[PDB]
């Protein structure tokens, strides 16, 4: 399996809003168990009076949402880190190895 992370900072003012992006909750974060596709919104971050400036996925990132945390330091800013989980089977391009240096890509 693979577990990734997508961190962002928030510091008129920038908040964690709805920016209205299909499977999203009211606080700008996807619920646990939503299969996130590519080119979608993983963090709902906007401003007042409808000013949407968020972070979107690339065309090589996918997976489902497992957990999302919220934290804040003593400066007065909040933090967010959405974690994505994907289980990957060994395909025809994975590279194995050994205990003696006999590395090799899967052929068939």
């Amino acid at each position: 399996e693979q577990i990734r992370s997508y961190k962002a900072e928030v510091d008129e003012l920038v908040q964690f809003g709805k920016t209205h992006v299909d499977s999203l909750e009211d606080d700008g974060f996807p619920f646990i168990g939503a299969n996130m596709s590519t080119g979608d919104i993983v963090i709902g971050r906007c401003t007042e009076s409808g000013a949407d400036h968020s972070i979107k996925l690339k065309h090589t990132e996918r997976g489902i949402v497992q957990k999302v945390v919220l934290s804040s330091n003593d400066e007065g800013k909040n933090f967010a880190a959405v974690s994505l989980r994907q289980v990957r089977s060994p395909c025809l391009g994975d590279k194995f190895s050994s205990m003696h240096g006999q590395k090799g890509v899967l052929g068939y």
Binding site: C91, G93, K95, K103, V105, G107, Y108
Partner: protein
């Protein structure tokens, strides 16, 4: 200069293909566009699918970094086959490439004009540069399994 209409993938071994033949999977061939002008026969074939997909019959350039000698830029005929996002070719054809299948990638350049398509299967393709002009002899010799089999067949007796 960096150029468009290219692709970069790792390669694996497949002795089921021909000599001047490679294999592009469906996920790459369903996105790479190759332009070709309209003809009188396929007027009902292009309008029901100019910008068409990478079908069979086309040719693309092959390249392994870095370019060692002149014969490391062979243009081979494409052939689509269902594979999980990896390309494959004949392991006896990797002798001009001077690379193994331990993780080496292959650069792929795709032409679009007809003047860059007819010139590929005339001076660049594998059926034309069959003479290794650095040495003056054959270029595509026997591989690893075929050499041992051709030895054992004639020595075992």
């Amino acid at each position: 200069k960096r150029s468009d209409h290219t692709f970069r993938t790792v390669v694996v071994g497949d002795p089921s293909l021909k000599l001047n033949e490679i294999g592009i999977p469906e996920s790459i061939a369903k996105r790479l566009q190759v332009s070709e002008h309209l003809n009188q026969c396929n007027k009902e074939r292009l309008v029901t699918s100019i910008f068409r997909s990478l079908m069979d019959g086309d040719t693309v350039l092959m390249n392994r970094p870095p370019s060692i000698h002149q014969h490391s830029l062979i243009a081979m005929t494409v052939r689509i086959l269902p594979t999980t996002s990896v390309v494959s070719l004949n392991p006896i054809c990797c002798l001009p490439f001077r690379g193994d299948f331990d993780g080496d990638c292959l650069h792929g350049y795709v032409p679009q004009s007809i003047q860059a398509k007819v010139e590929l299967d005339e001076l660049v393709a594998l059926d034309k540069q069959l003479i290794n002009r650095q040495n003056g002899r054959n270029l595509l010799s026997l591989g690893q399994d075929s050499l041992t089999a051709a030895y054992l067949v004639n020595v075992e007796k």
